[PDB]
PDB file of N, CA, C and O in Angstrom:
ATOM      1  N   UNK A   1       0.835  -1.207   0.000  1.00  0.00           N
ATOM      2  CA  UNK A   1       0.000   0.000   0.000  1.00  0.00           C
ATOM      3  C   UNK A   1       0.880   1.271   0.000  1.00  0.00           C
ATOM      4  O   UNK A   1       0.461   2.405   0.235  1.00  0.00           O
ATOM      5  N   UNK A   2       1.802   1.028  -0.213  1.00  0.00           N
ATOM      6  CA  UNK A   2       3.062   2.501  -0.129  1.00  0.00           C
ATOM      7  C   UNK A   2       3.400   3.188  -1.769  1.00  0.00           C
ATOM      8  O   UNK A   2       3.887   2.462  -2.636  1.00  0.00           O
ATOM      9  N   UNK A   3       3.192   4.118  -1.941  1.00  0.00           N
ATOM     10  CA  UNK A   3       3.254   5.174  -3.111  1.00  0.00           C
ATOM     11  C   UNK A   3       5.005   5.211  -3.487  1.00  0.00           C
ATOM     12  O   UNK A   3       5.859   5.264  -2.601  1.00  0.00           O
ATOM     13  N   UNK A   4       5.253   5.180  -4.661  1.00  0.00           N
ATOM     14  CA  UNK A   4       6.261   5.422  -5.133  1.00  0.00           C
ATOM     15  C   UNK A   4       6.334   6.327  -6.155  1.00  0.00           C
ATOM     16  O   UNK A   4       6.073   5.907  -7.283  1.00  0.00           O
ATOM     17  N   UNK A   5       6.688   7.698  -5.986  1.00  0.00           N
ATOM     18  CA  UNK A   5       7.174   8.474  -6.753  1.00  0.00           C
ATOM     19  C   UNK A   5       7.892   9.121  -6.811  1.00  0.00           C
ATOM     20  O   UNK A   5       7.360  10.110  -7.316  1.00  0.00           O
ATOM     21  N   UNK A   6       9.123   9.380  -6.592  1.00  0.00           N
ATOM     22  CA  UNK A   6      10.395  10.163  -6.444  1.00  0.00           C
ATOM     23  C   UNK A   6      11.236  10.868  -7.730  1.00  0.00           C
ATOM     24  O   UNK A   6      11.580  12.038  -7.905  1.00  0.00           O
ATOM     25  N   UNK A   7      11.385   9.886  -8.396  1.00  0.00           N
ATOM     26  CA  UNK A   7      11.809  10.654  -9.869  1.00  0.00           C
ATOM     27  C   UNK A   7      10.883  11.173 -11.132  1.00  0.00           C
ATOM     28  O   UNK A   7      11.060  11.839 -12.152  1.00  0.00           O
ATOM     29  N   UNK A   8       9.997  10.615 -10.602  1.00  0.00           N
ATOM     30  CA  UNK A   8       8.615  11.456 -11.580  1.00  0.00           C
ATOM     31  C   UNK A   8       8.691  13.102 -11.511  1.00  0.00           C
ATOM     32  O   UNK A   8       8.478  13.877 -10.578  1.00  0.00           O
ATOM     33  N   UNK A   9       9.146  13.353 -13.105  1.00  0.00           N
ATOM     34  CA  UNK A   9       9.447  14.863 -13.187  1.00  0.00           C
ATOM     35  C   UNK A   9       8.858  15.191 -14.842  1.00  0.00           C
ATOM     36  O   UNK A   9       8.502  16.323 -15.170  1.00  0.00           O
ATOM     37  N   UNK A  10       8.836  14.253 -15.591  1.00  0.00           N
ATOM     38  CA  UNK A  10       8.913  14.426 -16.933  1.00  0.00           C
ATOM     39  C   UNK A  10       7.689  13.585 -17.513  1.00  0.00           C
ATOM     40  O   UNK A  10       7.224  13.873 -18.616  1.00  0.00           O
ATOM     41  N   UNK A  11       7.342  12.878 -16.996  1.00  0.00           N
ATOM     42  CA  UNK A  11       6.179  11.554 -16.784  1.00  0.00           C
ATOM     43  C   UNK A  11       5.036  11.541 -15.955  1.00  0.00           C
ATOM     44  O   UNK A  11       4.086  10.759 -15.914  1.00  0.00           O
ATOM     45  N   UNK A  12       5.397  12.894 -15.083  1.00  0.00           N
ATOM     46  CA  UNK A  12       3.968  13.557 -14.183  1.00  0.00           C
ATOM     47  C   UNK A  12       3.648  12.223 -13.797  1.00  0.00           C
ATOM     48  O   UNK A  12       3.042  11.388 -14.469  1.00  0.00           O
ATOM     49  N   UNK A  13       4.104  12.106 -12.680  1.00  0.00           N
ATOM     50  CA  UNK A  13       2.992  11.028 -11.720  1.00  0.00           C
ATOM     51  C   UNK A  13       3.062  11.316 -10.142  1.00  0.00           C
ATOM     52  O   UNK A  13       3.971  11.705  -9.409  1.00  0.00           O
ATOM     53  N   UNK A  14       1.766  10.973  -9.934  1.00  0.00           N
ATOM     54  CA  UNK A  14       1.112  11.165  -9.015  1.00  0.00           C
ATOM     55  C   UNK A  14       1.142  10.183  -7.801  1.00  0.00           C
ATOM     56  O   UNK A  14       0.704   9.095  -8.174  1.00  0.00           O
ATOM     57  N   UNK A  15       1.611  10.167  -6.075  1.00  0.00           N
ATOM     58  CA  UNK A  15       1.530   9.006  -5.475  1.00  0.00           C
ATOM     59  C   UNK A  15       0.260   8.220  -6.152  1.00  0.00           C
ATOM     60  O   UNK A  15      -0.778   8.514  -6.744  1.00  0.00           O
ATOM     61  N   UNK A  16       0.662   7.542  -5.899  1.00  0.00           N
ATOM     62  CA  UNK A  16      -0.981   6.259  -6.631  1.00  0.00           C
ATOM     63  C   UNK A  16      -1.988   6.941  -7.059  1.00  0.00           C
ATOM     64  O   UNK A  16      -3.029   7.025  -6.408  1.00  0.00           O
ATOM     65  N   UNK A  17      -1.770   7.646  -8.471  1.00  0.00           N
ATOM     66  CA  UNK A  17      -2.521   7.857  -9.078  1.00  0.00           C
ATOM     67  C   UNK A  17      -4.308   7.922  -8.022  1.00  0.00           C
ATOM     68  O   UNK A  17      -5.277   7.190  -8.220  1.00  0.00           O
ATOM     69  N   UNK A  18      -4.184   9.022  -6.987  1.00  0.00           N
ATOM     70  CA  UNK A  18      -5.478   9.128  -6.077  1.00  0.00           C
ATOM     71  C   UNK A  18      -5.509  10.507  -5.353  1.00  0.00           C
ATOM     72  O   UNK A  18      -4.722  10.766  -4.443  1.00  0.00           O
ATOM     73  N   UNK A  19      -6.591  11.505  -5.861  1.00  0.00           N
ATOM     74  CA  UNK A  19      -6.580  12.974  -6.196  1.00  0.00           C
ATOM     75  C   UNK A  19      -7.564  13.467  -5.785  1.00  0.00           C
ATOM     76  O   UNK A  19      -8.421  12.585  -5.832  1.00  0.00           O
ATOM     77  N   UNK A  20      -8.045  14.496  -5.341  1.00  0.00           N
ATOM     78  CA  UNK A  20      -9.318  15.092  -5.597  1.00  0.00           C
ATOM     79  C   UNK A  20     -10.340  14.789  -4.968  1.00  0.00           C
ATOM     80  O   UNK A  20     -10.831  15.631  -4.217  1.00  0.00           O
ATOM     81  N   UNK A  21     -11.056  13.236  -5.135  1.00  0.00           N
ATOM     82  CA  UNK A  21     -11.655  12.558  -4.557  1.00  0.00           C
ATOM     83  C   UNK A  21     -10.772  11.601  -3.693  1.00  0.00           C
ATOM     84  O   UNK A  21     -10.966  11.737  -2.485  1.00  0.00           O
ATOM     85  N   UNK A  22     -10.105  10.927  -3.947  1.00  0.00           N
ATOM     86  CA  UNK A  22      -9.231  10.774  -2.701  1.00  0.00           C
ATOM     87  C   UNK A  22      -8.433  11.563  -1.962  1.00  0.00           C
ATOM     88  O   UNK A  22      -8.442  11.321  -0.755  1.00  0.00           O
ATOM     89  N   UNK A  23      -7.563  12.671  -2.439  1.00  0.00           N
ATOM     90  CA  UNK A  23      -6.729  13.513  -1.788  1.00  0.00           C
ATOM     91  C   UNK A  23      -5.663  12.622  -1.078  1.00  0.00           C
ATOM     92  O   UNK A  23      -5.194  13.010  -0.008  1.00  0.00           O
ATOM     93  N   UNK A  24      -5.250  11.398  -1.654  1.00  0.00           N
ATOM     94  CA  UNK A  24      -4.111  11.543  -1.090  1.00  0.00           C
ATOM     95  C   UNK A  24      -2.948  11.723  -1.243  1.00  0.00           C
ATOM     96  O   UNK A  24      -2.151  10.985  -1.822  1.00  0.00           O
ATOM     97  N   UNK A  25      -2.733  12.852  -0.668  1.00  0.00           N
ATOM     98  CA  UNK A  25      -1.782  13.692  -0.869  1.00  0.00           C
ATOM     99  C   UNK A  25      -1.731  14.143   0.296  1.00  0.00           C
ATOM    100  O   UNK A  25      -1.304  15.297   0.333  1.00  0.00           O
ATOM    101  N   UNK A  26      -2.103  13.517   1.675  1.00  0.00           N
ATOM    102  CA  UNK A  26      -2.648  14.410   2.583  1.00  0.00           C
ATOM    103  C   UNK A  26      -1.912  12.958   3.663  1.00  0.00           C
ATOM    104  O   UNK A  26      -1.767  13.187   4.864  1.00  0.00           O
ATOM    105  N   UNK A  27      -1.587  11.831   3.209  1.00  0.00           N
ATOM    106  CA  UNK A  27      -1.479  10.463   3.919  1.00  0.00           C
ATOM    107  C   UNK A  27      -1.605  10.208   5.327  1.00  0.00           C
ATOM    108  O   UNK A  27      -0.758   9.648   6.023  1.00  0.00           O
ATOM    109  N   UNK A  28      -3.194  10.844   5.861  1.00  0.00           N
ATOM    110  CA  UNK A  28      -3.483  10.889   6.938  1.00  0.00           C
ATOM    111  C   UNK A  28      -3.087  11.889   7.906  1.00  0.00           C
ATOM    112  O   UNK A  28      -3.938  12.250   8.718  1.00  0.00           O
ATOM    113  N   UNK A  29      -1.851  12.425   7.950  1.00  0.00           N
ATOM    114  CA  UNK A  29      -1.475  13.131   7.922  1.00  0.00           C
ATOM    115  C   UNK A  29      -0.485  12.940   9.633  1.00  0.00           C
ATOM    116  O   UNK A  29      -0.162  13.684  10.559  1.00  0.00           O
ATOM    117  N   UNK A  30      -0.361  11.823   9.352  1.00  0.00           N
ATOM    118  CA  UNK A  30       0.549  11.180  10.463  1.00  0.00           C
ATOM    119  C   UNK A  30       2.251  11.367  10.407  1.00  0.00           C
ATOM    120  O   UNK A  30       3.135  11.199   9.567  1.00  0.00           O
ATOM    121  N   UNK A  31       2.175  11.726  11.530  1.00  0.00           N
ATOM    122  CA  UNK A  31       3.258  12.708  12.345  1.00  0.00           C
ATOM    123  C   UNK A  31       4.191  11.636  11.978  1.00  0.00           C
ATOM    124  O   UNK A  31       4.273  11.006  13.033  1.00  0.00           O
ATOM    125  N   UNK A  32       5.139  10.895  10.902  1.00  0.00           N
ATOM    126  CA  UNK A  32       5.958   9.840  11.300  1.00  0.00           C
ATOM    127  C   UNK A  32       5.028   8.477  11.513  1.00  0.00           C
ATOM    128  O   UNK A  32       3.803   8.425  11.405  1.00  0.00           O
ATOM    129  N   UNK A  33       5.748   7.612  11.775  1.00  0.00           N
ATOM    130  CA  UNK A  33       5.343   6.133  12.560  1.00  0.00           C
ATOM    131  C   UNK A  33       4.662   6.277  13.572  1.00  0.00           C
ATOM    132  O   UNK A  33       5.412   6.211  14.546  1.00  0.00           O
ATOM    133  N   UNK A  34       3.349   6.486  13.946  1.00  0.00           N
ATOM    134  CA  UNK A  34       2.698   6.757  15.249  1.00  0.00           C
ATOM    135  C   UNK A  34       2.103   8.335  15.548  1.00  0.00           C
ATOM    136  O   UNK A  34       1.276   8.729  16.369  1.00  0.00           O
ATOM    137  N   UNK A  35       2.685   8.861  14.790  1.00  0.00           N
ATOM    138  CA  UNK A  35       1.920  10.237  14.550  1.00  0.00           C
ATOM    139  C   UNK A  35       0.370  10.719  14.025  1.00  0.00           C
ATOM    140  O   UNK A  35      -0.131   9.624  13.767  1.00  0.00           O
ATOM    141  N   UNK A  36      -0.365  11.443  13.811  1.00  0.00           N
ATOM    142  CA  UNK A  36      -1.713  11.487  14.200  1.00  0.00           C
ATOM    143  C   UNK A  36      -2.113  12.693  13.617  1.00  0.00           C
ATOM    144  O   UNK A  36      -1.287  13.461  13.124  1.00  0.00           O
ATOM    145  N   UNK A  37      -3.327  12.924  13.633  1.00  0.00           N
ATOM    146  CA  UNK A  37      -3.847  14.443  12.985  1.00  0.00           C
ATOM    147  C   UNK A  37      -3.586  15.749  14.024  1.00  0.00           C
ATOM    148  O   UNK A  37      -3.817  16.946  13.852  1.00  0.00           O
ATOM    149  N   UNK A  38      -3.175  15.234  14.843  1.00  0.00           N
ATOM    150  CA  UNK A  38      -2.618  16.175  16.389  1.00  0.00           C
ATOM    151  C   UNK A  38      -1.895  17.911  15.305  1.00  0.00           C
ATOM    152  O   UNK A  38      -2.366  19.047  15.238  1.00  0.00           O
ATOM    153  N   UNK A  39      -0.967  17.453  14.828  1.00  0.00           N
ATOM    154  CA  UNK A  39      -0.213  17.983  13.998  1.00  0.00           C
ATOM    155  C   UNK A  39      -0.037  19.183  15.015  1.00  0.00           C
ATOM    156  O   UNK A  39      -0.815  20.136  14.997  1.00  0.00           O
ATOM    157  N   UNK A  40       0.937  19.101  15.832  1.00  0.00           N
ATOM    158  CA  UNK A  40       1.710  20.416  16.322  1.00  0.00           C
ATOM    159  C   UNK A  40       3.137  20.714  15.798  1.00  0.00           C
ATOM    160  O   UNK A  40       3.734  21.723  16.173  1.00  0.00           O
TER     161      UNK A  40
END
């Protein structure tokens, strides 16, 4: 379940192709390993 995109520059890609309606781009938005929407 882990996104790979790092050298995508010329080929436009997107973590797993999931946008808009998914938004993720946002990956819960956990602080690290154990981190949380807390976000301080």
């Amino acid at each position: 379940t882990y996104h790979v995109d790092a050298n995508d520059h010329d080929q436009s890609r997107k973590s797993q192709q999931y946008d808009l309606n998914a938004l993720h781009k946002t990956t819960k938005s956990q602080r690290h390993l154990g981190g949380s929407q807390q976000l301080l």
